[PDB]
Amino acid sequence: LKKLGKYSNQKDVANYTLSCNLREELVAVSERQDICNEI
Amino acid sequence: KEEVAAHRNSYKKSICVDMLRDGFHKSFTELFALMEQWDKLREAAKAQSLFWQQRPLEDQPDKLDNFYHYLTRAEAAERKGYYEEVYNNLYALACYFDNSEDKW
Amino acid sequence: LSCEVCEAPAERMCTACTVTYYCGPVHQKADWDSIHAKICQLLIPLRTTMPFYNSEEERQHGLQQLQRRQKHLIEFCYTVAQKYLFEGRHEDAVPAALHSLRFRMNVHGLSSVELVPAYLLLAEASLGLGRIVQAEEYLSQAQWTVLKSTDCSNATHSLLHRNLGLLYIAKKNLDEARYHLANDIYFASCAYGTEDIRTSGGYFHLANIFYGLKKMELADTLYTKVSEIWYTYLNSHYQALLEARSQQTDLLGKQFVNDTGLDEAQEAEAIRILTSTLIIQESTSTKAPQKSILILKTLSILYYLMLECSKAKEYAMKALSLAETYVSEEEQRFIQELLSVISAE
Amino acid sequence: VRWDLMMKTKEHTKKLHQMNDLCLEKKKLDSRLNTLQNQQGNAF
Ligand SMILES: [Zn+2]
Ligand SMILES: [Zn+2]
């Protein structure tokens, strides 16, 4: 199990990081929208 | 959109924009003066003076919120000539600022 | 090829220069006035294609001196355009601005922030022509440039916000006019500091909106702030001039130069701002004539530093007559001294 | 316990497909910026 324990903890940290990644992409998409929407 | 730019720009920017947009022009002038004073002090002083021990003001939104509420009130009073309203609001700031970092 | 001044046909030669191209007589005359009264021939040294610079050092020298001449004339053209906008000669501004833009395109390229000043002058001329959507074109370009821009300075962005506000001021939302001029005022304040004439120009446009809103006390407050700025700067020069002239005398002696230190376009904008401020300050509230006396002092000082002697005298005499009833002796004695300086100089 | 790893992977892929959608939005906005560039052309 310890192999899957290691990869499960890897996914725990990777999914939290992905939550920061999707926050990053959400600000990226919203600001790129903002460029076209302001003008 | 513009609201997103307003929150996404610095809270310092956000309150400057609110202030001058809504005619709190002198409230901006005061905020600028104090903010520059804070920055100057925290840069300039001797390397472990309390000014260098001060927190960053810009990081610290609750103090900018206190400036927003009290300066908006005090300028609304300042316009009137009802000088005691100005006194009371500025003293409310002053006593909020009755702490070691805010002494000046 | 085209009429470079408007991209209509090259209907006629520029007989003054051959290098300039005109869509016949109307643009021929307007561009003759606009660029050729200012410099005319100097564009020919720009327009001539170089013969071969034969070595690396020759190429470098020839490029450097050509480019720096181009830059110098680019800025002179942009100053001329600014003055034509302030003088209301928007017809003459259109050639000067379009030339300055095209030369910025050539040296800097269309992508440059350096075009943004010219683009905004082309908006300003368009609004002088009422061509609101045309101004919106060049503001659109500028806005994309600055939003991308890696380095836009506080002054540059203040220019952007100021012209954005002016465009909405031709539009119909006073809220946007305040919002954008406020941004201009902020960026001016942090670039220049809070007492610069350019910041005061922001405050002036804000005051004019508050006057249109008939919010008399805020409008007058803004007019006061601007008037105080203009007063303080002109005082700084006038005092320094008299103090230096007083300070010391070797047997060599000296005489100091009476000087505004302003751009002539900044002097024209000073006159426009102070005159509108005076008239609006009176019409909003004749109850404070002393503020009119202050503006009269300010303009009389400006006129003296120009040696606009006629208005310097007239406005000093007005200020003195008003100050004798309204004000303490310090005002009257200052205005008398200024009149004595004008009449002696 | 493997089921938890599978479901965490599946929701990870859900966030991948969300961001790929945003990549298509970015491609759209790139085409919009090119459209506005064509407006730059500044004929008169
Ligand atoms: Zn010519
Ligand atoms: Zn034409």
Nearest to C46 by CA among C22, C65, C21, C27: C65
Handedness of CA B14, B20, B24, B30 (dihedral sign): positive
Contact D42/C137, CB-based, under 8 Å? yes
List of long-range contacts for C108-114, beta carbons under 8 Å, 24+ apart: C110/D40, C111/C145, C112/C145, C113/C145, C113/C146, C113/C149, C113/C151, C113/C152, C113/C156
Please give, rounded to a whole number of angstroms, the shortest distance from the CA of B59 to a CA of chain A: 21
Against chain B, the chains showing at least 3 CB pairs within 8 Å are A, C
- Taking an 8 Å cut-off on Cβ atoms, the answer to whether B4 and A38 are in contact is no
Cα C78 to middle of ligand 1, angstroms:
18
* Chain D interface includes A16 (CB < 8 A): no
CB atoms inside a 10 Å sphere around CB D12: 14
Spell out which residues of chain C touch residue B10, defining contact as CB-CB under 8 Å.
none
Gap from A28 CA to chain D (nearest CA, Å): 9
Q: Does C67 reach chain D within 8 Å, measured CB to CB?
A: no
Q: How close C115 comes to chain D (CA, Å)?
A: 12
Residues of chain A neighbouring C140 (CB-CB closer than 8 A): 39
Q: Which of C252, C235, C249, C266 is nearest to C337 (CA)?
A: C235
Does residue D5 sit at the C interface (CB-CB below 8 Å)?
no
- State the structure-solving technique: cryo-EM
Instruction: Tell me how far the alpha carbon of residue C89 lies from the centroid of ligand 2, in angstroms.
Output: 17
- Annotated binding-site residues of C read 6, 14, 17, 20, 23, 27, 36
